[PDB]
Amino acid sequence: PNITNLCPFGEVFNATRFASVYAWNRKRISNCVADYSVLYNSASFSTFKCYGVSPTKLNDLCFTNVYADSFVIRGDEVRQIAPGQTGKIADYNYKLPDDFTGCVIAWNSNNLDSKVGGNYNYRYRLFRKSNLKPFERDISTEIYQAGSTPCNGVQGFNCYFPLQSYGFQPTNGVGYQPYRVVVLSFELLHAPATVCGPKKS
Amino acid sequence: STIEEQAKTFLDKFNHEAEDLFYQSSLASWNYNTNITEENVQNMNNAGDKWSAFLKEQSTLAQMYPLQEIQNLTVKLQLQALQQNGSSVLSEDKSKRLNTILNTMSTIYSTGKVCNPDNPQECLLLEPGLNEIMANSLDYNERLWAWESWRSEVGKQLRPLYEEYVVLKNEMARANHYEDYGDYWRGDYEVNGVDGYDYSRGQLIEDVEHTFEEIKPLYEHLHAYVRAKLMNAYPSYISPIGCLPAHLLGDMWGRFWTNLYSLTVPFGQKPNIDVTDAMVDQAWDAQRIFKEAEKFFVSVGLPNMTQGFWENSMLTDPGNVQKAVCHPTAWDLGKGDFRILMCTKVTMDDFLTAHHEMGHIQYDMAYAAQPFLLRNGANEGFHEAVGEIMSLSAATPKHLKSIGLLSPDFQEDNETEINFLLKQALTIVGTLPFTYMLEKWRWMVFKGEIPKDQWMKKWWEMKREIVGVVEPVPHDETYCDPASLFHVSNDYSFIRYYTRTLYQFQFQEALCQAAKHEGPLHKCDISNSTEAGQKLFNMLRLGKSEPWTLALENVVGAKNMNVRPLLNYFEPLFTWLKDQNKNSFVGWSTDWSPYA
Ligand SMILES: *[C@@H]1O[C@H](CO)[C@@H](O)[C@H](O)[C@H]1NC(C)=O
Ligand SMILES: *[C@@H]1O[C@H](CO)[C@@H](O)[C@H](O)[C@H]1NC(C)=O
Ligand SMILES: *[C@@H]1O[C@H](CO)[C@@H](O)[C@H](O)[C@H]1NC(C)=O
Ligand SMILES: *[C@@H]1O[C@H](CO)[C@@H](O)[C@H](O)[C@H]1NC(C)=O
Ligand SMILES: *[C@@H]1O[C@H](CO)[C@@H](O)[C@H](O)[C@H]1NC(C)=O
Ligand SMILES: *[C@@H]1O[C@H](CO)[C@@H](O)[C@H](O)[C@H]1NC(C)=O
Ligand SMILES: *[C@@H]1O[C@H](CO)[C@@H](O)[C@H](O)[C@H]1NC(C)=O
């Protein structure tokens, strides 16, 4: 069959702006044909680690929906976007389930997301009372209470603001340079699967 | 909840907002150093003021968490580092007076120009006007004039200033729960709370005396040989039974004896190992010097330099139009940015300096995983020692033959090893009594052992007793002879060089034993040895997280600084010097026998 209506992967990977890791964007991809070989054969990605499925058979399998979660993290924090990991990003910003089927794609973005004065537009949640559940988004800006005293709204002693900005300079090391991460989540539900791979001729 | 969790959250908040501010300060300092312009000076000053004010506010916030309720060693170490008052405990009037005194001493030392009376039309500054005269002249009265005139002007200006400085620093230290300023300096080596690895501030003086008592025979034989050669050079001034005249040691203060290698050479007719012409013939650029250094560090197993290092470092002099500081410096700017600022020439000295500074860079890179306030050396000695070991390994004839800079048929006989060891002794052994005597004198001044009216009578008495160097003419109390040196006049600790020198050869023995070198210690090269690099990197990765005693256990297997590796390094030279001193008299007399 002649195929059209490819899945819109251009508006996620080639987006002019990415979201912050605390407020990571989720785009639901449905009712199209997903060509995954375009992503896999690209040389622009530093991490293309797939958990629970292999990239070769992605272009054949069919899924109900594809969830594209997009954010920016540091170079040293790409390791924490994996099942079972521990860190600031995993516990307080973006948590992946252990039974996760999907792919974590990350690439260096020092060219776009770093400016000479410092790019402070990307923020991360540094403190939360409890760890996040898998696929939870916390965009609350309530003052963290680290001590018995009632914070009472004011940032004083033992009371800190949970969202801390990130500093991005072009001269930083590879472990501090901004990395754009897109996590694709593949699920199969009782509804008929509509995100199928292309059928080769 | 608990105090410890509160301190951990506060430390996370600190490390996060302090790494970026430190990076801004460091980047402004780099932009000043590579580009000396007034706006860059203003930007550097503004960033430094922001950094200092942020540290003051974080220290003020940090003091509110009591130390005794924290059991985690790393958290306690960071809180101890942050909670230090420094000069903040002192009153604002006295703090401003102390800062003014420090600045004016810096200006007097840096901008001090002295020349001969009756010829005042032009005068010579310390660098390089007086350095060249002290290092290269062979005239007795010229060196005497330069030495006495510089100590007359600088000491007579700095003596009241130093008298105020000792009182203010003692006041700050006693306000900070220390006995004196000497205890404050010795507190860098203080380890408390670790079972068995504890080190006391009072143990440092005892360990330094205990090591120096074993240094003394080698130094006495070296002093006798140098005395005989200087007696040959200057026929009547130097006595066979007395101390060396102060102005004849090849440097302004007596810090190094390395400028006497030409006068005191054992075998002048035999060649040196200078490789400068070989690099010039093969057109070695500064980039090739750093690439060869990188090859050396990957040979031993350490990580290679980052992309940011090659892109952002300045390894060549920029030009006449753009002004830069010429001093070689390794910069850990923060956030994974490591750079070397060196005006590299095609010389052996620059090549060894490149190895030394890349060693500093490797040490900085190793503890990047550690928290921000623990990103330092375990003590002040280790940071310099890890560069000096690379300098030691690179200068060996085996490394030079391996990298192609030396001919493979170059003959390494005993005479070349003797003269090389003598040069290393003049640089390394000769600085040890001067360093120990200077620090002991400053500790006794801070402790109050020496009253203000007896500072110089004791000082020369110490110099005759320890260094074996006599004053050319007597000096009264209007002189301030110690403060003519850069470190003492600008409030710097001086025991780091003594500790660095001992740690250098302890590390060298440990790595050479790890690398299975089977010969003399000075002939040892640590290239191609993965296990030696692993043993080094185990200590390198710790940074300031662990006590320096534990780090030394990690490398050499000892819990304390030791003097036997240094003596083992210079054992061929020690036997040769003992043989050569049969006619002459080893040791000196403290009396005024040569000249006074
Ligand atoms: C995104 O940008 C790269 C850069 O050239 C381009 O080759 C690619 O086709 C774009 N789209 C996707 C979906 O990767
Ligand atoms: C050095 O400073 C001058 C004057 O601000 C500027 O024009 C020049 O581009 C700078 N060069 C570098 C390498 O920073
Ligand atoms: C001390 O705190 C660090 C956090 O920096 C933690 O990783 C470590 O396990 C703690 N050590 C102990 C003995 O609790
Ligand atoms: C620092 O100074 C303050 C004010 O005098 C004092 O309360 C605090 O105990 C001092 N801390 C240390 C470590 O000396
Ligand atoms: C440093 O070493 C790694 C692995 O050995 C290598 O991939 C990298 O290219 C090296 N760096 C440079 C600048 O060549
Ligand atoms: C060097 O070795 C030769 C060969 O035995 C010996 O004659 C000479 O005295 C030695 N020189 C020194 C300085 O040890
Ligand atoms: C170290 O290893 C390199 C690469 O194998 C080799 O060329 C070099 O000669 C070795 N060094 C020595 C001293 O043998």
Author numbering:
A (entry chain B): 330 to 530
B (entry chain E): 19 to 614
Task: Please share text taken word for word from the publication where this structure appeared.
The Delta and Kappa variants of SARS-CoV-2 co-emerged in India in late 2020, with the Delta variant underlying the resurgence of COVID-19, even in countries with high vaccination rates. Within the receptor-binding domain (RBD) of the S protein, both the Kappa and Delta variants share an identical substitutional mutation (L452R) with the previously emerged variants of interest B.1.427/429 (Epsilon). Finally, the P681R mutation (present in all B.1.617 lineages) immediately precedes the furin cleavage consensus sequence (682-RRSR/SVA-688), with initial reports suggesting that the P681R mutation enhances cleavage, and consequently S protein post-fusion transition.
Biolayer interferometry (BLI) analysis of trimeric variant S proteins revealed limited (no change) and moderate (~2-fold) enhancements in ACE2 affinity for the Kappa and Delta variants respectively. The focus-refined atomic structure of the Kappa variant S protein in complex with ACE2 reveals limited structural changes at the RBD-ACE2 interface. The Kappa variant E484Q mutation results in the loss of an electrostatic interaction between residue E484 and residue K31 within ACE2, likely resulting in a weaker interaction at this site. However, the enhanced electrostatic complementarity afforded by the accompanying L452R mutation may present a compensatory mutation accounting for the lost E484–K31 interaction. The same L452R mutation in the Kappa variant likely did not result in an overall change in ACE2 affinity due to the deleterious effects of a lost electrostatic interaction from the E484Q mutation.
